[PDB]
Paper text:
Therefore, the RBD of S (S-RBD) is a major target of the host humoral immunity. The former recognizes a conserved epitope in the ridge of the S-RBD external subdomain and inhibits viral entry by competing with ACE2 binding, and the latter binds to the inner face of the S-RBD core subdomain and neutralizes viral infection likely by destabilizing the architecture of S trimer.
Overall, Nb-015 mainly utilized its long CDR3 and a small portion of its framework region to interact with a concave epitope located largely at the ridge of the S-RBD external subdomain. It revealed that, similar to ACE2, Nb-015 could only bind to S-RBD in the up conformation. Residue T417 of the Gamma S-RBD, however, featured with a branched structure at the Cβ atom, which would cause some steric hindrance with Y101 and thereby compromise the interaction between the nanobody and S-RBD.
Residue numbers in the entry:
A (entry chain A): 335 to 498, 502 to 518, 523 to 527
B (entry chain B): 2 to 120
């Protein structure tokens, strides 16, 4: 019953700084079908056993999705640090859920759709867990104000991925967050 | 918990000098490290940043004369200063924070500084 298809099988994914969230409620999910899928390079769960997922019920499941580099997939995990974890998409230390990643070079790179995926490069502070920042204000690195323009010691905050791997290649990522204060296994 | 600058001293104008920032009490693998400077009577100025992945960005003011670099093995961050002029005279400070990049207002740890005087 759970519409994971719209999430995993969308033709374009979100940029990581503007990561997508879908709320999954009032349905049945067969997690083992996903876990056993040969398509995924990464399928790592935290706070729950991957096999026991079909036995559990949760209040809601949130599916967050985006594209990053293969060598950034390690940052989508509890307790990690780096450009992605700090400034784009942050998991909490006590994360309960699964992180699924697969190579999307043929869809997302210049040999495929040649999509424009971006990331945030500068930020005043690290993101809180599951916080999202889609602002495009000029970032002030020095003491002098930017006044809305990329002048002296001022920087546009986003940059497009090049993808030029596999560490350099685009990976699509789906994070499943399991909220229990509706969505069960078969 | 500690940043210690060294390598300061007297330089002749046009010359070079390399400052070092040694971090102890943590590995800077997850920390941004920045160099700042304060000239007498002036506001503190940002000089450059070495991100936690080794990439860098630096102040337009320096006209590409300084380059920052890091060596996580020695847990040290360097500032290579070239073509020094008299207005580069200042106390140079190393600073860090647990973040990918630096920030002028949000640095979390500071060294005591080291003086660089250009003739
Ligand atoms: C996505 O599409 C493939 C077919 O290419 C299908 O086998 C898979 O089950 C779909 N994923 C989901 C979550 O429905």
């Amino acid at each position: 019953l759970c519409p994971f298809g719209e999430v995993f099988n969308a033709t374009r994914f979100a940029s990581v700084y503007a990561w997508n969230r879908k709320r999954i409620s009032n349905c049945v999910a067969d997690y083992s079908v996903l876990y056993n899928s040969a398509s995924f390079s990464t399928f790592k769960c935290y706070g729950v056993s991957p096999t026991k997922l079909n036995d559990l019920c949760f209040t809601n499941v949130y599916a967050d999705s985006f594209v990053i580099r293969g060598d950034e997939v390690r940052q989508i995990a509890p307790g990690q640090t780096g450009k992605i974890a700090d400034y784009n998409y942050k998991l909490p230390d006590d994360f309960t859920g699964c992180v699924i990643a697969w190579n999307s070079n043929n869809l997302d790179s210049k040999v495929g759709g040649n999509y424009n995926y971006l990331y945030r490069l500068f930020r005043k502070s690290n993101l809180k867990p599951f916080e999202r920042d889609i602002s495009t204000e000029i970032y002030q690195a020095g003491s002098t104000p930017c006044n809305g323009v990329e002048g002296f010691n001022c920087y546009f905050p986003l940059q497009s991925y090049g993808f030029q791997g596999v560490g350099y290649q685009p990976y699509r990522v789906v994070v499943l967050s399991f909220e229990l204060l509706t969505v069960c296994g078969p | 918990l500690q940043l210690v600058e060294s390598g300061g001293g007297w330089v002749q104008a046009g010359g070079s000098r390399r400052l070092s920032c040694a971090a102890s009490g943590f590995t800077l693998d997850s920390y941004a490290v920045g160099w700042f400077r304060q000239a007498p009577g002036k506001e503190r100025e940002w000089v450059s940043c070495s991100r936690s992945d080794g990439t860098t960005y630096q102040s337009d003011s320096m006209k590409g004369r300084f380059t920052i670099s890091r060596d996580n093995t020695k847990n040290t961050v360097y500032l290579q200063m070239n073509s020094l002029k008299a207005e580069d005279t200042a106390v140079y400070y190393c600073a860090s924070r647990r973040s990918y990049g630096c920030d002028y207002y949000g640095m979390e740890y500071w060294g005591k500084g080291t003086l660089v005087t250009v003739s």
